[PDB]
């Protein structure tokens, strides 16, 4: 496999202290993923640490990473402070047959952050700071000349800039596309996948807002909102909280029938009892609004009033609107009372 540089599944065998191109000193392997690896390297020229994403030596992955590179380079031509919620690509090169993207070095992701709390949740104040930054990143991506859909927003793809501070960035535009250049129907990580993607419908930037809504509840409860083992189970778990989707969407959905059944009179139902009846698992209770927050652990904390939890719940319900046409958009999200 590539003269002993690659392995049988196309990864570079990382070796600590290897120097690439009289420039990058590889320190260590920090992450392994389905598309490649990330290594910590020191760049001698710029005298700084960088994270180098080493992609697979196979054409399919190389072809998708070239779009990623293209999207990151496109984003870097906008001077707006908003692009700073997106990880920065410093450069890219080919090395021993792997495409390599050099990124700024960031700290750990928000799943790892919940892990510090033993999955009890970060506070509402921190959740709100994350929410404002993500809404701003989504606003940036919705810039008409970008119109970028991330397509895989989840806690693992949001990284803290530093362990002791609350600034975050979005990483991994490896499944991303621009509006009108869609390619795959099976997208988004399952917990964070929108109904539109589940029902096989056309989709747009709103799918990222759905992911963000699921993410923000999880950051505060410590637990995924909708933890499906598969699509049917995923849909049923969405239905426990938000009810049966509207008829007008179901009538247009190509895969309605994977999850639902349409009676001769038009009205739609779940296929023919493990799940709670539809709409009976209220976010009001999942968040513990009047019962002291998640697990009643935020009873008496500043910033965690019934009023606050009511603003948070509201914003989330607007992010989890079944209709992509009316689902809250970043510009309006940023004006919601939760952020006042």
């Amino acid at each position: 496999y590539n003269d002993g540089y690659d392995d049988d599944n196309y990864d570079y065998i990382v070796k600590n202290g290897e120097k690439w191109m009289d420039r990058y000193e590889i320190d260590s392997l920090i992450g392994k993923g389905s598309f490649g690896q990330v290594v910590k390297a020191y760049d001698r020229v710029e005298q700084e640490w960088v994270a180098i994403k080493i992609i697979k030596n196979k054409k399919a992955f190389l072809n998708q990473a070239q779009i990623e590179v293209r999207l990151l380079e496109l984003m870097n031509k906008h001077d707006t402070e908003m692009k700073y919620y997106i990880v920065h690509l410093k450069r890219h090169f080919m090395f021993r047959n792997h495409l390599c993207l050099v990124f700024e070095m960031l700290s750990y992701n928000l799943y790892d952050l919940l892990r510090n709390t033993n999955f009890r949740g970060v506070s509402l104040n921190l959740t709100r700071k994350f929410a404002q930054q993500m809404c701003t990143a989504l606003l940036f991506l919705a810039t008409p000349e970008l119109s970028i859909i991330h397509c895989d927003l989840k806690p693992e793809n949001i990284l803290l800039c530093n362990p002791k501070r609350s600034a975050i960035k979005i990483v991994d535009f490896g499944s991303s596309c621009q509006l009108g250049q869609r390619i795959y129907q099976y997208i988004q990580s399952r917990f964070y996948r929108s109904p539109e993607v589940l029902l096989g419908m056309p989709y747009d930037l709103a799918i990222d807002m759905w992911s963000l809504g699921c993410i923000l509840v999880e950051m505060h409860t410590g637990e995924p909102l909708f933890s499906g083992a598969n699509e049917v189970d995923q849909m049923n778990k969405i239905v426990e909280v938000l009810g049966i989707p509207p008829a007008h969407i179901l009538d247009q959905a190509p895969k309605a029938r994977k999850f639902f059944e349409k009676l001769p009179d038009g009205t739609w139902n779940l296929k023919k009892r493990e799940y709670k009846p539809p709409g009976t698992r209220k976010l009001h209770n999942i968040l513990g609004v009047e019962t002291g927050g998640p697990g009643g652990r935020r009873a008496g904390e500043s910033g965690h009033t019934v009023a606050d939890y009511l603003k948070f719940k509201d914003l989330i319900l607007r992010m989890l609107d079944y209709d992509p046409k009316t689902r809250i958009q970043p510009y309006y999200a940023l004006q919601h009372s939760f952020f006042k």
């Binding site: 389905s34 598309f35 399919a60 799943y111 795959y184 099976y186 997208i187 917990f191």
Partner: peptide, 8 residues
Amino acid sequence: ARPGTPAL
């Protein structure tokens, strides 16, 4: 358990 980006 944590899924899990759809793959190529």
